[PDB]
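Note to self: the last two entries modelled the partners one at a time, which told us nothing about the interface. This time every component goes in together.
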Amino acid sequence: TQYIFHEEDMNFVDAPTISRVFDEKTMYRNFSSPRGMCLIINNEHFEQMPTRNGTKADKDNLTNLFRCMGYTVICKDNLTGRGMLLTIRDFAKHESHGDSAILVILSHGEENVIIGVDDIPISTHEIYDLLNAANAPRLANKPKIVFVQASRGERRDNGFPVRKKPSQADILIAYATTAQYVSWRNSARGSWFIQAVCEVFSTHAKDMDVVELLTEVNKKVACGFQTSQGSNILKQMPEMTSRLLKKFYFWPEARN
Amino acid sequence: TQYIFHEEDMNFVDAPTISRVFDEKTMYRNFSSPRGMCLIINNEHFEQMPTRNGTKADKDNLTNLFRCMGYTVICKDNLTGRGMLLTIRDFAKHESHGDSAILVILSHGEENVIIGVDDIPISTHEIYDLLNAANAPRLANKPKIVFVQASRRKKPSQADILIAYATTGSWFIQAVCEVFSTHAKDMDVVELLTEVNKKVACGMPEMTSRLLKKFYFWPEARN
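The predicted structure of the combined assembly is written out below.
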């Protein structure tokens, strides 16, 4: 048992349903033949910070998932702080953008900070500024989904017993963990959050918009995942920050 | 043209629909006679920061809205930094808590800060900690919706919380009242706040969700 996403696991929609279901007023347009581009930033090795084992299994599974959902995936292993900014700024340039963009950052981080391979910190806010309609007019009015697989602090959740658009518009960040809290991985399996994303998305991307999916993802890690070390049993609570104006479905078709 | 919420504007659900619609696995329970309690913290006057005019119209509109939706509203105008913490910590202590709780903070501040009447900054994260299942066990396992209007097996304890954060009556507050009125009955909060985002933008607020399931207000005859 070492979870891996398979094309077969994916459920797909047909054009008919998309023609029927779609509604410009309530949902984002996402029908580009290549849905759009997906930039995955994968930091595994650091100068003065431990190796991020099993971040390869995440990257691969995510690459499969987003390719299966009709995306053009691009990978950038081990980027410096200044590297992530520049890559992201350039990504916003790729005029080959479809109806939606997806950014995935897999790295070490703190609250509002993503740490580069050179151990240099990066303000998450600055990376969102690169995506706003001002700095990415090639992406203005288009939905941008960012997945951040990184810690955001060193707190350990112990759990409990059971017209004009404002510039920041059309962006949703899917975090693996709440602010100031740690994000768990496992050399063996991989990211709690990444596996959840793969499971849920596989099954419900066709009929659930991202926010519902991520709510399921939230439910899967919160209720499903647990770890420990002589002091307590630890939990993890992923968190989605949304500045969307409409419902956003991936509408995975026959483009894997 | 000076928006004000009225009890009439509300669209309600009936017991049957809730009976039929509800699904424990996919949505939170929200059926307390009083749905729950709603703390509204409204800071208008500051020592060295300008007054927040019309913040009174917001407070009232929201107070009406959340009462109309079956909540017991409590107001606390002009609290210091430490004031808010204690009020919020005491709100978590109420024990008179229903299936869900609502916190509203209308004050100065920015992003990771909410400034008090004594012009003392409060950490937004610190106030969210107060509602976690560790500090509010009377709310553990129950949805908590935080509205911030700031101007310039086991679950994780941080589970079940949603922050609606708006940065600068108000276009936002008004939108909130409009959208909720018409759709609280049939949309869950995230959909509602997405509509709100649409109202403000076309007509940038952000929602941070740690919910595991869908949360409907299900407003009925508990006006």
